[PDB]
């Protein structure tokens, strides 16, 4: 069985509404699925850049993905 | 979009992770079970850290959504835009005015120097180990040298900020967006040679145009800015490059109206905020200065810094610190430069004295007594150096620096007191009490105090000034006692006939004259100046207190908030205002009841003819004391002009003679304005009592434009 | 107009979003969702809203105040006023003053020793509102609001 508490501190892949994708460590999540991510890397096509601490609202998140080996480690 | 690398790059995004699983569904189920108030987070993590977070799809918090024009998006450094000379000159011009906007106008580095695509290009190649090839000599060689000069400048500013002299992101912004050039950026000799070589290319041009003259002056200006590091690396006091910077800035200003400049579109943009790693919200580019006058201000402020090297006494440095940054806030580069130029690498002051020698010089000139590595002296010397460094802070941090000093001076004085070292205890007391007074009056310049608080602060400073004058008067009496003791020896010698005991007295007397007399006279005349200055401060505070008491006598102001509220009381508000002085033992902070009783003795509670007679005594004092203050200021101004060798006053203002005169001139203006305003108030209020439909007035603390705003004018104004 | 001042309901999600819209309109530089979550989730009892009961939209917030409190030094509780916003159509009716009064009253009943806020030195209306309640300026911060100028640190002592 799983909880959100198991996920915090682990890198997540969050594709946004646009072609941009965010890779960051999950810091906090609230009841409305607003996420706060640290050490965020913004990937758009060829380009990549760091953006630090970013919060992503509900409407902005297209999908949430985690690495397979990391996911099994949390359990 | 259509570009090849962005297309193929989409497949490479997931390459780093071998296997990814979608967990969007699991996240929504769990979040639904959470109570609305709940947040899932690490227990150690504090939610205050998230208060400085970005937010996607928020225009004001998302730099990825910055709107750029086609020229801004497609700008290429390798294209030689036409016309080349005019475009290169326009590029260099805007970059220099970006330098001014950054340092003079306190704009951010990403929106000024880093907004240029050429500086970004050079810094990016420099990180690895001009960075663009256009095939045109103006872009590749001349403009490349310009960018290198400015990039050398910002690197030097980084070294200045590393010393921790001033406060980051307040006096000077240095968000360089993760740029670290290591040792790859060339040394000063290479940069100056590169700029000189571009100058010779411009000499070769047979045709002479205004744009060409512009570029020649810009190039020489950049050379001067690169030479600013000479004042720290070699502690040079030479003003040649600083004078050239002024001349070239003046020549460019006359050229500005004659021609029109247009940099290539997209040369300066917010592009770097959108694509380079950025942890901050996007910011628009602020309007740039229209001329090069900011370089003139920078050059003269730095020239003023180098003057302190000519100091020959502790009093000359002390008065330099009191005045060099006092009339108006100096350029931030000059304000960083002064403590680094004053307190040098080899742990010496100006390369002349050690820290303890410098401290003992202050005690000697104030007390006229020889000492005849102590921990108390080591701490006192560090305390004194921090006092000098606080002088070059901005106008707000300057007052805040005294918060730390007052309790440290007090503790230091009490520690000297416990070991019965009364000479150092005396000098520490002078510095503490002078700092208490300076800290309090500085609040009026910053408009910290509301009009109803004006009596409390002005009377407290009068109270402090009275104790300082009493202390100084006793100090000067001790000096005179020592002077008369030497004089009495000479009187006794004349009575004595030739004998062996007369040889002893002549021996004692000659040593005193050779080793003690000259310093006693200098200290006596120095204390004479301090007594005149503190009596001016004392009189001005009293004049303000009388003015307040006249206003309250007519019912126009009170020493508390006019509209009461349920939440607080006047005693708590009074104690909060005087909290900084609460832990100082000598002089004791007067109790709340003493503040109230003192005001009652000033306020005229009588009515009618009895009121009129007491009011006349108060107004006559203001007018009479203002004229006496003007006479005292005039005497000080004569002494400043005459110098320190005229036998009456010693002011030590040789290095800041013009600035100290300008200060007392402003002080004289305020004094006259206080008297004029007292007459206006009395004439207005006598007419107002007569009329039943009297006006409703409020009191405002008004700054005199050419005055000294430690003593604002308490002005009536119709509501 | 029939203005009603009530504490925040943390369970109401629409009430939450309405507060964000009000505060964001006034700000030159905005706050993230987690700025609001830092205040409202940890000090829900220190955020108040104003609603017009006789308006067409009765329960929509037309004004709000957001506050926190923490120990300062070790011995004193410092209340803090983070945000104050009043809708443009409802300005000039003393609504902001009533929101400050009800928030300070709550923080005083929570044994705050003092209330602290920052404001622009050029914000005459804010200075007049706070200093009229007993606040005094304790500090001036150089270019605290960047090109909008310096700030004053205002403190109202309660104990
Ligand atoms: Cl441009
Ligand atoms: Cl000692
Ligand atoms: Cl008082």
Residue numbers in the entry:
A (entry chain C): 3 to 77
B (entry chain B): 0 to 128, 133 to 375, 382 to 728
C (entry chain A): 1 to 159
Sentences from the paper on this structure:
The transfer of an acetyl group from acetyl-coenzyme A to the free α-amino group on the N-terminus of substrate proteins is catalyzed by N-terminal acetyltransferases (NATs), and is considered to be irreversible, as no Nt-deacetylase has been identified so far. NatC acetylates protein N-termini starting with methionine, followed by a hydrophobic or amphipathic amino acid, with amino acids at positions 3 and 4 also contributing to NatC recognition. NatC forms a heterotrimeric complex, containing the catalytic subunit Naa30, the small auxiliary subunit Naa38 and the large auxiliary subunit Naa35. The large auxiliary subunit Naa35 acts as the central assembly hub of the NatC complex, forming extensive interactions with Naa30 and Naa38.
Structures of the selenomethionine-derivatized (NatC, apo) and native, CoA-bound (NatC•CoA) complex were determined to 2.40 and 2.45 Å resolution, respectively. Both crystallized in space group P212121. The derivatized structures were solved by single-wavelength anomalous diffraction (SAD) and refined to Rwork and Rfree values of 19.5% and 22.3%, respectively. With an RMSD of 0.218 Å, binding of CoA induced only minor structural changes in the catalytic subunit compared to the apo structure. In the peptide-free NatC structures, Leu27 in the α1–α2 loop is positioned in a pocket in between helices α1 and α2. Naa30-Asn147 forms a hydrogen bond with Naa35-Gln106 in the apo and CoA/yArl3-bound NatC structures, but traversed a distance of 8.8 Å in the Gag-bound structure to form an intramolecular hydrogen bond with Naa30-Glu120.
